[PDB]
Amino acid sequence: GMSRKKNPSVIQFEKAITEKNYEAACTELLDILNKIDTNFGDIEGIDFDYPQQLETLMQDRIVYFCTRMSNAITQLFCDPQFSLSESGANRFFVVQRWLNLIFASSPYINADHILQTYNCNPERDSIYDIYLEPNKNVLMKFAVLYLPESNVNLNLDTMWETDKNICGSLCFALQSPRFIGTPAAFSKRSTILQWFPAKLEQFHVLDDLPSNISHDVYMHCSYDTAENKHNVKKALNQVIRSHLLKCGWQDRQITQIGMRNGKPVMVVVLEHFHSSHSIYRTHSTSMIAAREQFYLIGLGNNAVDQAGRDVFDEFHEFDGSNILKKLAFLKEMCEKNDAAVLYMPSIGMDLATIFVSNARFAPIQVIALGHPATTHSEFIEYVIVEDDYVGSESCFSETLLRLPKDALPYVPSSLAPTDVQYVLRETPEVVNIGIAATTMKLNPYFLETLKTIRDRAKVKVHFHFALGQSIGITHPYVARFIRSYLGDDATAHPHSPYNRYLDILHNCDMMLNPFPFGNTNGIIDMVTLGLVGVCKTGPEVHEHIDEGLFKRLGLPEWLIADSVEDYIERAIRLAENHQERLALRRHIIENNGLKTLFSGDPSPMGKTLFAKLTEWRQTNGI
Ligand SMILES: O=c1ccn([C@@H]2O[C@H](COP(=O)(O)OP(=O)(O)O[C@H]3O[C@H](CO)[C@@H](O)[C@H](O)[C@H]3F)[C@@H](O)[C@H]2O)c(=O)[nH]1
């Protein structure tokens, strides 16, 4: 084959380690992990030999890969000759989420075997305690392999006093994975969310942290269960803001209000906007309905297809990866239009958007809930959101512009099936239960809750998990996590193409929604197949969307659960009462609630926002 760049090689990596060329070794290692990061856990285009038996057995080949990569890393890190640079460590923290999987999808589970070689204290109380010689080289080796699935004891105060920078870097790393679900991982992260924000405020800059997974940090805290999970977002905002000013940022000066073709100018900063992404399917209709009230400049990237740019009076490309340049291009774009309104429909998916959220480009800066969590940023005034999707407003630092239920009509996907065949099984022997859930939405409570349902159900149940983001080397880890709760009563399906995903669900007799962070598109998917399921509701928007959307689709209120314990009774009831279940499905199939989502009056967004530029003009003047 001919190709753009040389593939990373397990063999090169192995050579390096034999030759005790540590520099090459770290390099090959870093290049492997990066490539895996780029492919979301897929290992195609990593070079390694392997027994022919594994040619057609992908899951087995993956495990084989992870085991073999584990062993090489072991041979390397237990070398006491091996000196890790700070830069070196910093780069590893960025890809620690992938290091975790090298071990966790291997039979070895974690790298605690490597940690044990660093202990220097033969007279210690518990094996779970590693005592280190007081030099920095070995501390960084230790931190780097302090993986989510570690059983080794670490105390944050102790560590934080030893080296703020490392301790912070590791806390970043442990919030970074898209699957933080196992008791060991979820508990490491729970603790960090309570302990770290205080310590994070104290940073002036991102210079000494793994800057490149910052956005993962920001997004992922919404998947804990703590009332106050979002606190780390405040602390991070401050650091980013601080880091922005040290770069020589001047907040844009609010003077005039440029008009175009009558209407004032709205700048829309986009993260992941293709007509295929759900950010379009939800928040594109409301954006066009605001061109009658405003003039829309949309700033996205190359990736955005034609149909995506056509939702703007005009669309500009962001010029590359450099954040400061991205902000320069946005400042001049807002000065040149004395722009009135900055709208970001998603904030979190791109780091540069979080930097934007901590500066002044417009007198009315608004977000929506492409990622449904507050920002804890002072430079963000309002949040667009459908009214039936709201729990407590106290969950948000901003002010909630609560729109009617129809204000945000969804454009369906043009992969959506039209000939769908329906499967209402009467008196099935095993009630097959589907769970549409990306990996971020799995945790010990949810899996404990499913274990309980299975134990208590008076009927046989099998869980099929359709696991968005469980790709490549992620999956064996995840599948095991599920087996650890449900043994032979669950199947864990990898990330699949859409039609295949639907085939998995179409095979179920009902579905269950994860909590705390619930589903949206998964419920469209649910009714699309003519199914009913259960969900939880809660104060946070990502808890409550489910409640709302159920109601909007004309499913009854008993399928909605305030407590974990409610969830169980309802789940069981719906698995037990076959005749009830089918009656509810027959309801939904005939009363096609779905088509009502593509219905609605999309104007309210632009109106409510003009109404605020009105109120803003009159309190300040122009
Ligand atoms: O094996 C699989 C599993 C799922 N899918 C499909 O992936 C889609 C992603 O939405 P899904 O409900 O899975 O995740 P969700 O949290 O809603 O993601 C959106 O909301 C997220 C909130 O931040 C946002 O990050 C994200 O971009 C949004 F999509 C959904 O249509 C599934 O039908 C698939 O094709 N194959």
XYZ file of C-alpha atoms and ligand atoms in Angstrom:
658
model
C 0.000 0.000 0.000
C 0.880 3.651 -0.592
C -0.196 6.090 2.089
C 0.226 9.553 3.495
C 2.435 8.836 6.543
C 4.193 5.690 7.844
C 1.919 3.650 10.114
C 2.888 3.334 13.804
C 4.387 -0.099 14.496
C 4.052 -2.322 17.544
C 7.244 -3.918 16.240
C 9.167 -0.624 16.067
C 7.944 0.084 19.590
C 9.260 -3.311 20.680
C 12.636 -2.802 18.915
C 13.113 0.552 20.662
C 12.604 -1.061 24.061
C 15.044 -3.880 23.354
C 17.669 -1.405 22.148
C 16.857 0.720 25.232
C 16.365 3.632 22.890
C 13.844 5.218 25.205
C 13.363 8.292 22.995
C 12.234 6.289 19.933
C 10.117 4.112 22.241
C 8.139 6.971 23.773
C 7.786 8.304 20.253
C 6.410 5.123 18.729
C 4.193 4.732 21.778
C 2.884 8.320 21.512
C 2.253 7.872 17.777
C 0.287 4.672 18.351
C -1.860 6.239 21.034
C -2.447 9.394 18.962
C -3.535 7.330 15.986
C -5.953 5.444 18.225
C -7.266 8.756 19.598
C -7.816 9.922 16.047
C -9.823 6.786 15.198
C -11.796 6.716 18.487
C -10.250 3.440 19.606
C -10.037 1.682 16.229
C -6.627 0.116 15.572
C -6.599 -0.035 11.757
C -3.335 1.377 10.467
C -1.337 0.322 13.499
C 1.160 -2.263 12.253
C 1.521 -5.563 14.147
C 1.996 -9.294 13.298
C -0.439 -11.807 14.783
C -1.468 -15.504 14.685
C -3.561 -16.336 11.613
C -6.332 -17.595 13.913
C -7.080 -13.943 14.728
C -7.453 -12.831 11.094
C -11.263 -13.021 11.208
C -11.847 -12.574 14.958
C -11.776 -8.851 15.605
C -12.598 -8.732 19.337
C -9.926 -11.367 19.944
C -7.392 -9.498 17.750
C -8.109 -6.336 19.764
C -7.472 -8.091 23.095
C -4.334 -9.601 21.588
C -3.227 -6.108 20.557
C -3.888 -4.699 24.018
C -2.073 -7.521 25.794
C 0.974 -7.167 23.554
C 0.976 -3.364 23.908
C 0.556 -3.823 27.665
C 3.638 -6.016 27.847
C 5.816 -3.588 25.906
C 4.724 -0.661 28.110
C 5.533 -2.825 31.141
C 9.069 -3.645 29.890
C 9.553 0.099 29.331
C 8.132 1.783 32.437
C 9.685 -0.708 34.894
C 13.047 0.191 33.384
C 14.609 2.382 36.115
C 16.923 3.763 33.400
C 13.887 5.368 31.764
C 13.674 9.134 32.383
C 10.374 10.785 31.488
C 10.426 14.449 30.425
C 7.798 16.874 31.728
C 6.803 17.425 28.081
C 6.929 13.645 27.840
C 4.562 13.202 30.759
C 2.344 16.000 29.510
C 1.833 14.249 26.171
C 1.033 10.942 27.917
C -1.607 12.554 30.166
C -3.398 13.700 27.009
C -3.649 10.110 25.811
C -3.951 8.506 29.245
C -7.577 7.667 28.429
C -6.200 5.350 25.707
C -3.455 3.937 27.943
C -6.254 2.922 30.302
C -7.792 0.778 27.543
C -4.486 -0.849 26.517
C -4.568 -2.445 29.980
C -8.318 -2.523 30.725
C -9.173 -4.428 27.532
C -6.146 -6.655 28.085
C -6.610 -9.482 30.636
C -4.440 -7.457 33.068
C -7.111 -4.767 33.797
C -4.696 -2.030 34.890
C -1.000 -1.345 35.173
C -0.802 -1.660 38.983
C 1.838 -4.343 38.348
C 4.086 -1.522 37.069
C 3.225 0.787 39.960
C 4.400 -1.936 42.417
C 7.991 -1.762 41.033
C 8.162 1.881 42.085
C 7.565 1.109 45.797
C 10.649 1.638 47.996
C 9.166 0.937 51.429
C 9.372 -2.804 52.285
C 7.913 -2.119 55.764
C 4.563 -0.715 54.576
C 1.060 -1.445 55.965
C -0.923 -2.407 52.839
C 0.143 -3.555 49.329
C -2.256 -0.916 47.973
C 0.233 1.773 49.140
C 3.096 2.759 46.850
C 5.784 4.897 48.512
C 8.043 6.791 46.030
C 11.619 8.086 46.225
C 11.274 11.910 46.297
C 12.576 12.636 42.763
C 10.232 13.969 40.065
C 11.111 11.491 37.283
C 9.487 8.543 39.061
C 6.485 10.530 40.276
C 5.533 11.301 36.643
C 5.916 7.630 35.639
C 3.636 6.801 38.571
C 1.016 9.422 37.806
C 0.920 8.568 34.113
C 0.040 4.922 34.919
C -2.336 5.900 37.695
C -5.107 4.766 35.395
C -8.901 4.904 35.999
C -9.036 1.159 36.680
C -6.230 1.310 39.309
C -6.787 -0.227 42.738
C -3.705 1.556 44.107
C -4.259 4.137 46.849
C -3.634 7.801 46.070
C -4.343 10.773 48.366
C -4.895 14.045 46.528
C -3.802 16.380 49.325
C -0.505 14.478 49.635
C 0.041 14.573 45.871
C -1.165 18.181 45.518
C 1.491 19.380 48.019
C 4.222 17.385 46.232
C 3.557 18.907 42.788
C 0.469 20.955 41.909
C 1.197 20.489 38.205
C 1.339 16.694 38.079
C -1.601 16.267 40.456
C -3.655 18.613 38.288
C -2.584 16.859 35.083
C -3.662 13.463 36.457
C -7.029 14.892 37.582
C -7.465 16.140 34.019
C -6.547 12.746 32.629
C -9.078 10.903 34.835
C -11.993 13.057 33.721
C -10.960 12.654 30.075
C -12.351 9.172 29.001
C -15.631 8.823 27.104
C -16.291 5.769 29.267
C -15.938 6.398 33.027
C -18.448 3.810 34.201
C -16.680 1.093 36.209
C -16.795 1.537 40.011
C -13.054 2.257 40.060
C -13.232 4.905 37.293
C -16.534 6.528 38.358
C -15.339 6.894 41.936
C -12.001 8.347 40.942
C -14.016 10.947 38.975
C -16.733 11.565 41.670
C -13.950 12.424 44.115
C -12.182 14.733 41.613
C -15.412 16.697 41.000
C -15.703 17.512 44.727
C -11.961 17.984 45.482
C -10.373 19.487 42.344
C -12.320 22.745 41.552
C -10.779 24.500 44.614
C -7.282 23.453 43.472
C -7.985 24.259 39.809
C -8.964 27.920 40.449
C -5.391 28.430 41.692
C -3.888 27.925 38.192
C -2.999 31.053 36.216
C -2.468 29.247 32.883
C -3.000 25.971 30.947
C 0.741 25.987 30.165
C 1.520 23.194 32.668
C -1.643 21.064 32.225
C -2.936 18.791 29.417
C -4.612 21.704 27.654
C -5.787 19.520 24.746
C -8.240 17.449 26.843
C -9.671 20.508 28.634
C -12.896 20.338 26.700
C -13.369 16.696 27.654
C -13.049 17.820 31.293
C -15.749 20.465 30.774
C -18.229 18.162 29.063
C -17.758 14.968 31.055
C -18.639 16.245 34.538
C -22.320 16.286 33.447
C -22.250 12.470 33.609
C -21.541 12.309 37.394
C -24.519 12.107 39.763
C -23.531 14.868 42.212
C -25.907 17.839 42.496
C -22.878 20.122 42.165
C -20.982 18.226 39.437
C -20.623 21.285 37.194
C -18.421 23.157 39.707
C -15.259 22.124 37.822
C -16.607 24.156 34.836
C -16.495 27.371 36.912
C -12.956 26.689 38.068
C -11.885 25.935 34.481
C -13.584 29.061 33.095
C -11.470 31.180 35.518
C -8.223 29.474 34.476
C -9.085 29.804 30.784
C -10.039 33.475 31.280
C -6.807 34.103 33.210
C -4.871 32.282 30.411
C -6.648 34.403 27.757
C -5.649 37.762 29.377
C -1.982 36.663 29.793
C -2.099 36.071 26.025
C -2.993 39.752 25.579
C -6.717 39.586 24.956
C -8.685 42.821 24.755
C -12.412 42.377 25.391
C -14.254 43.887 22.410
C -15.470 47.454 23.132
C -19.278 47.831 23.015
C -20.035 51.062 21.063
C -22.418 50.877 18.073
C -24.932 48.251 16.776
C -24.408 47.502 13.064
C -27.471 46.709 10.917
C -27.631 44.742 7.683
C -30.689 44.897 5.423
C -32.491 46.476 8.389
C -31.912 43.744 10.943
C -29.025 43.663 13.504
C -26.181 41.156 13.167
C -26.016 37.774 14.968
C -22.701 35.867 14.950
C -23.122 32.085 15.318
C -20.021 30.142 16.419
C -20.401 26.450 15.507
C -18.661 23.340 16.857
C -19.774 20.255 14.909
C -22.271 21.381 12.284
C -22.878 19.015 9.380
C -26.446 18.366 8.197
C -25.912 14.808 9.513
C -24.922 15.851 13.082
C -27.829 16.342 15.548
C -26.836 19.946 16.252
C -28.411 20.661 12.819
C -31.415 18.377 13.202
C -32.424 20.307 16.371
C -31.255 23.937 16.239
C -31.092 24.760 12.458
C -34.815 25.458 12.039
C -34.847 28.036 14.853
C -31.807 29.695 13.277
C -33.499 30.246 9.874
C -36.620 31.519 11.666
C -34.357 34.215 13.138
C -33.054 35.528 9.779
C -36.412 37.355 9.570
C -35.408 39.136 12.815
C -31.582 39.163 12.385
C -28.711 38.895 9.926
C -26.762 35.652 10.546
C -23.008 35.299 10.163
C -22.120 31.637 10.834
C -18.480 30.781 11.691
C -17.729 27.050 11.344
C -14.918 24.883 9.935
C -14.191 23.129 6.614
C -16.181 20.033 7.704
C -19.525 21.873 7.397
C -21.309 20.734 4.222
C -23.340 22.937 1.842
C -26.752 22.420 3.480
C -25.112 23.487 6.767
C -23.773 26.825 5.522
C -27.085 27.583 3.796
C -28.729 28.238 7.182
C -26.785 31.519 7.412
C -27.159 34.809 5.610
C -23.443 34.068 5.153
C -20.917 31.458 6.347
C -17.172 31.799 7.048
C -14.570 29.052 7.676
C -12.420 28.994 10.809
C -8.742 29.089 9.817
C -7.231 25.986 11.478
C -6.446 24.749 15.026
C -4.883 27.875 16.698
C -7.349 29.139 19.325
C -6.004 32.707 19.562
C -6.319 33.056 15.756
C -9.868 31.650 15.922
C -10.639 34.409 18.484
C -8.861 37.110 16.464
C -10.966 36.146 13.402
C -14.093 36.403 15.599
C -13.175 39.734 17.237
C -12.613 41.492 13.907
C -15.789 39.836 12.590
C -17.757 41.327 15.493
C -16.095 44.765 15.394
C -16.647 44.980 11.595
C -20.364 44.394 12.210
C -20.664 45.986 15.671
C -22.427 42.639 16.179
C -25.375 42.448 18.571
C -25.783 38.766 19.475
C -23.334 35.843 19.838
C -25.131 32.461 19.680
C -23.386 29.145 20.247
C -25.950 26.275 19.869
C -23.393 23.847 21.416
C -20.642 24.786 23.852
C -18.117 22.173 25.038
C -17.368 19.966 22.023
C -14.539 22.237 20.865
C -12.082 23.832 23.308
C -11.976 27.121 21.332
C -15.703 27.577 22.051
C -15.036 27.422 25.795
C -12.390 30.162 25.361
C -15.006 32.209 23.461
C -17.517 31.670 26.307
C -15.047 33.506 28.604
C -14.824 36.786 26.628
C -16.884 39.677 25.234
C -17.751 39.742 21.507
C -21.280 41.040 21.766
C -23.653 42.597 24.333
C -26.051 39.616 24.187
C -24.178 36.285 24.360
C -26.404 33.189 24.343
C -25.885 29.403 24.245
C -28.133 26.448 23.599
C -27.996 22.898 24.873
C -26.353 20.897 22.107
C -24.447 19.879 25.227
C -27.166 20.246 27.916
C -25.258 21.732 30.840
C -24.699 25.214 32.321
C -21.403 27.053 31.634
C -20.749 28.824 34.960
C -19.312 31.653 32.804
C -20.038 35.316 33.640
C -19.741 36.361 29.950
C -22.796 34.267 29.027
C -26.181 35.811 29.709
C -28.896 33.493 28.410
C -29.687 29.884 27.457
C -32.136 28.831 24.742
C -34.243 25.838 25.843
C -37.707 24.313 25.326
C -39.844 24.869 28.425
C -40.984 21.250 28.949
C -37.296 20.217 29.124
C -36.537 22.215 32.306
C -36.283 21.004 35.908
C -34.724 23.548 38.275
C -33.359 26.806 36.876
C -30.869 26.699 39.783
C -28.939 24.116 37.760
C -27.815 27.017 35.509
C -25.696 30.149 36.154
C -27.266 31.823 33.121
C -30.884 32.964 32.671
C -33.152 30.467 30.923
C -35.078 31.833 27.947
C -37.855 29.236 28.199
C -39.486 28.808 24.767
C -42.768 26.985 23.923
C -42.486 23.266 23.204
C -42.713 23.664 19.415
C -40.178 26.519 19.056
C -37.397 24.049 18.080
C -38.787 21.763 15.323
C -36.486 18.871 14.376
C -35.546 18.183 10.782
C -35.496 14.330 10.554
C -32.393 12.475 9.429
C -32.263 11.485 5.743
C -31.023 8.072 6.912
C -34.309 7.586 8.837
C -36.126 4.406 7.676
C -39.532 4.731 6.011
C -40.492 1.059 5.586
C -40.193 0.016 9.227
C -41.537 -3.422 10.158
C -42.948 -3.702 13.690
C -42.480 -6.543 16.158
C -45.064 -6.862 18.886
C -44.311 -10.208 20.503
C -47.170 -11.609 22.600
C -46.069 -13.648 25.685
C -42.289 -13.760 24.911
C -40.254 -16.245 26.933
C -37.477 -13.721 27.543
C -38.392 -10.026 27.455
C -35.579 -8.456 25.439
C -34.737 -5.017 26.825
C -32.899 -2.459 24.693
C -30.649 0.331 26.029
C -29.603 3.087 23.627
C -26.700 4.693 25.431
C -23.342 6.149 24.504
C -20.577 5.085 26.891
C -20.538 8.393 28.763
C -24.048 7.603 30.090
C -23.062 4.356 31.875
C -22.316 4.332 35.628
C -22.503 1.966 38.668
C -25.980 3.165 39.741
C -27.587 2.574 36.354
C -25.963 -0.894 36.036
C -26.744 -1.715 39.697
C -30.327 -0.683 38.908
C -30.523 -3.022 35.941
C -29.080 -5.884 38.031
C -31.895 -5.278 40.563
C -34.591 -5.226 37.895
C -33.338 -8.546 36.537
C -33.187 -10.073 40.049
C -36.728 -8.901 40.957
C -38.538 -9.360 37.606
C -40.982 -12.284 37.672
C -40.057 -12.918 33.984
C -36.799 -13.720 32.157
C -35.057 -10.571 30.817
C -32.087 -10.042 28.502
C -30.477 -6.595 28.071
C -29.143 -5.522 24.653
C -26.848 -2.483 24.994
C -26.307 -0.452 21.809
C -23.122 1.309 22.853
C -22.326 4.506 20.979
C -18.596 5.339 21.361
C -17.654 1.751 22.281
C -15.243 1.400 19.356
C -12.133 -0.709 18.774
C -10.124 -1.103 22.006
C -12.838 0.514 24.118
C -15.228 -2.391 23.793
C -13.730 -5.379 25.738
C -13.413 -3.178 28.816
C -17.024 -2.016 28.460
C -18.387 -5.453 27.708
C -16.734 -6.798 30.848
C -18.090 -3.951 32.982
C -21.535 -5.004 31.780
C -20.837 -8.725 32.384
C -19.686 -7.794 35.916
C -23.297 -6.792 36.686
C -25.506 -8.868 34.375
C -23.364 -11.892 33.440
C -25.080 -13.855 30.692
C -28.228 -11.677 30.799
C -26.711 -8.826 28.758
C -25.201 -8.513 25.269
C -22.953 -5.498 24.696
C -23.137 -4.362 21.044
C -20.299 -2.124 19.751
C -20.785 1.196 18.041
C -22.527 0.158 14.796
C -23.784 1.926 11.628
C -27.219 3.475 12.110
C -29.331 0.851 10.331
C -27.601 -1.929 12.321
C -28.099 -0.085 15.608
C -31.813 0.115 14.717
C -31.814 -3.642 13.937
C -30.571 -4.343 17.483
C -33.327 -2.242 19.088
C -36.034 -3.436 16.661
C -35.366 -6.842 18.164
C -36.279 -5.656 21.672
C -39.700 -5.741 23.359
C -39.090 -2.524 25.352
C -36.296 -0.078 26.258
C -34.765 1.562 29.349
C -33.217 4.997 29.425
C -29.936 5.661 31.315
C -29.717 8.256 34.093
C -28.638 10.768 35.204
C -27.883 12.018 31.682
C -30.772 10.670 29.606
C -31.510 10.303 25.897
C -32.997 12.480 23.155
C -32.280 11.003 19.738
C -32.546 7.547 21.405
C -36.223 8.306 22.151
C -36.816 9.397 18.554
C -35.170 6.051 17.673
C -37.453 4.335 20.237
C -40.842 5.549 18.912
C -39.494 5.266 15.335
C -39.525 1.485 15.999
C -42.873 1.775 17.837
C -41.504 0.970 21.300
C -42.245 2.109 24.815
C -39.748 2.289 27.684
C -39.065 3.880 31.067
C -36.971 6.874 32.080
C -35.862 9.013 34.987
C -36.431 12.745 35.422
C -34.477 15.213 37.538
C -33.562 18.897 38.141
C -30.950 19.047 35.379
C -32.037 19.509 31.760
C -30.230 16.302 30.690
C -32.240 14.489 33.424
C -35.579 16.057 32.432
C -35.538 16.080 28.596
C -36.773 12.466 28.837
C -39.835 13.435 30.936
C -40.629 16.231 28.498
C -40.146 14.281 25.314
C -42.218 11.366 26.630
C -45.072 13.774 27.359
C -44.661 15.382 23.886
C -44.949 11.894 22.286
C -48.060 11.016 24.281
C -46.549 8.277 26.437
C -48.129 8.026 29.932
C -46.654 9.522 33.086
C -46.217 6.192 34.908
C -43.263 5.456 32.574
C -41.499 8.442 34.192
C -39.688 7.918 37.498
C -38.663 10.439 40.176
C -36.466 8.045 42.235
C -34.158 5.124 41.472
C -36.724 2.943 43.229
C -39.657 4.139 41.078
C -37.508 3.341 38.005
C -37.250 -0.287 39.173
C -40.967 -0.803 39.881
C -41.970 0.645 36.504
C -39.259 -1.219 34.566
C -40.366 -4.475 36.203
C -44.080 -3.697 35.689
C -43.498 -3.071 31.982
C -41.407 -6.239 31.623
C -43.963 -8.265 33.605
C -47.302 -7.033 32.158
C -46.999 -8.193 28.536
C -50.588 -7.206 27.695
C -50.174 -3.770 29.194
C -46.887 -3.285 27.263
C -48.380 -4.198 23.887
C -51.432 -2.015 24.539
C -49.085 0.971 25.092
C -47.166 0.194 21.896
C -50.367 -0.171 19.865
C -51.326 3.278 21.240
C -48.099 4.924 20.087
C -48.015 3.230 16.681
C -51.531 4.395 15.801
C -51.163 7.872 17.401
C -47.950 8.597 15.467
C -46.634 11.135 17.988
C -43.331 11.329 16.087
C -44.461 13.566 13.168
C -45.336 16.287 15.701
C -41.617 16.924 16.355
C -40.998 18.033 12.782
C -44.024 20.314 13.372
C -43.921 23.713 15.090
C -43.604 27.522 14.888
C -39.791 28.175 14.903
C -39.995 31.951 15.245
C -39.878 32.339 19.086
C -36.064 32.176 19.308
C -35.384 35.234 17.111
C -38.294 37.150 18.681
C -37.224 36.581 22.295
C -33.672 37.641 21.351
C -34.718 40.809 19.480
C -36.881 41.535 22.545
C -33.659 41.441 24.636
C -31.673 43.716 22.296
C -34.735 45.981 22.623
C -34.460 45.804 26.469
C -30.650 46.194 26.251
C -30.656 49.208 23.888
C -33.077 51.015 26.281
C -31.071 50.428 29.492
C -27.728 51.482 27.974
C -28.593 53.239 24.753
C -26.782 52.153 21.564
O -24.052 1.956 17.675
C -24.627 3.037 17.540
C -25.160 3.829 18.607
C -25.806 4.971 18.332
N -26.004 5.418 17.050
C -26.700 6.695 16.797
O -25.873 7.729 17.252
C -26.670 8.919 17.444
C -26.053 9.730 18.565
O -27.048 10.112 19.533
P -27.177 9.214 20.838
O -28.572 9.339 21.382
O -26.542 7.891 20.558
O -26.208 10.065 21.756
P -26.713 11.468 22.287
O -26.177 11.616 23.672
O -28.167 11.697 21.979
O -25.813 12.373 21.331
C -26.137 13.699 21.010
O -26.003 14.586 22.118
C -24.666 14.649 22.667
C -24.727 15.575 23.872
O -23.520 16.356 24.042
C -23.687 15.105 21.566
O -22.355 15.030 22.071
C -23.780 14.237 20.311
O -23.061 14.848 19.243
C -25.223 14.071 19.865
F -25.287 13.044 18.898
C -28.113 8.398 17.597
O -28.884 8.527 16.415
C -27.994 6.883 17.581
O -29.109 6.425 16.854
C -25.503 4.720 15.959
O -25.639 5.105 14.796
N -24.839 3.552 16.278
